[PDB]
């Protein structure tokens, strides 16, 4: 019934915690390999994965309400589990919920010290809804290098969850763009790391656009993973665990 799951370390002995939001259509399972690397690459950091219930909602307003509910539930469970300094991690579309979680942690005066986002850039314009067909999505994801299920059952579940996560992230970022249009989005004094595979085709012009994360927090740091595409949790999970360890090192004081 908890919104989070302990995947590595032990909060009774750790020096910090990282709470992790999965890529589109993903969940804690997508972090298994990364978690297995944490004791070696990030010894002092315990790791929680966020469960994505994909609560049914009937409007953009209800989706935003759901983002708030889910982020609040994650903060509830995290702070109930640990007082340790916290790093928030997200891959790709999970960035939306990660931002919400980070902002709520800041609102609660929790000891949140960094935001680390893989394979995503800040959105500064109202987005476009996804009207592609299922075959169009699968062709696009295949070209981008995604892993895709072969069983039609798994394909249907994947496409449902992918469409849901894209809707959630579009609604949340559109909300942030609205706030920014009124000067109502406060930058938080939380450093931001943007981790990008140099061959990632979904973050165009990231060497310049990564700095847009400064609408969220500051300072902003870019780290490039040469030879890697968009799927950092699949193709260099040890490197991302190490990235979390490095963040902790940077914010440990
Ligand atoms: Na990935």
Numbering used by the authors: 2727 to 2979
Question: What does the paper behind this entry write?
Answer:
The structure of the optimized genetically truncated thioesterase domain, which we refer to as SulTE, was determined. The protein has a typical α/β hydrolase fold with seven central β strands (β2 to β8) flanked by four α helices on one side and three helices on another side. The first strand of the canonical α/β hydrolase fold is missing and hence the structure starts with the second β-strand, which is anti-parallel to the remaining six strands. A very long sixth α-helix along with seventh helix and the following loop (residues 2860–2877) form the lid region. The active site residues of the SulM thioesterase domain, Cys2818, Asp2926, and His2956, form the catalytic triad where the central histidine is 3.2 Å and 2.7 Å from the cysteine and aspartic acid residues, respectively. The nucleophile Cys2818 is present at the turn following the β5 strand, while Asp2926 is located on the loop that follows the β7 strand and His2956 is positioned on the loop after β8 strand. Unlike the position of the aspartic acid residue on β6 (position I) seen in other NRPS TE domains, only ObiF1 (39) and SulTE reposition the aspartic acid residue to the loop following strand β7 referred as position II. The SulM thioesterase domain lid loop, which spans residues Gly2844 to Val2918, contains two helices. In the SulTE structure, the loop that follows the β7 strand runs from Gly2923 to Val2946 and contains an unusually long α-310 composite helix. The first two residues of this helix, Tyr2932 and Pro2933, adopt a traditional α-helical conformation while the following nine residues form a 310 helix.
Nonribosomal peptide synthetases (NRPSs) are responsible for the production of important biologically active peptides. The large, multidomain NRPSs operate through an assembly line strategy in which the growing peptide is tethered to carrier domains that deliver the intermediates to neighboring catalytic domains. The paradigm monobactam antibiotic sulfazecin is produced through the activity of a terminal thioesterase domain of SulM, which catalyzes an unusual β-lactam–forming reaction in which the nitrogen of the C-terminal N-sulfo-2,3-diaminopropionate residue attacks its thioester tether to release the monobactam product. We have determined the structure of the thioesterase domain as both a free-standing domain and a didomain complex with the upstream holo peptidyl-carrier domain.
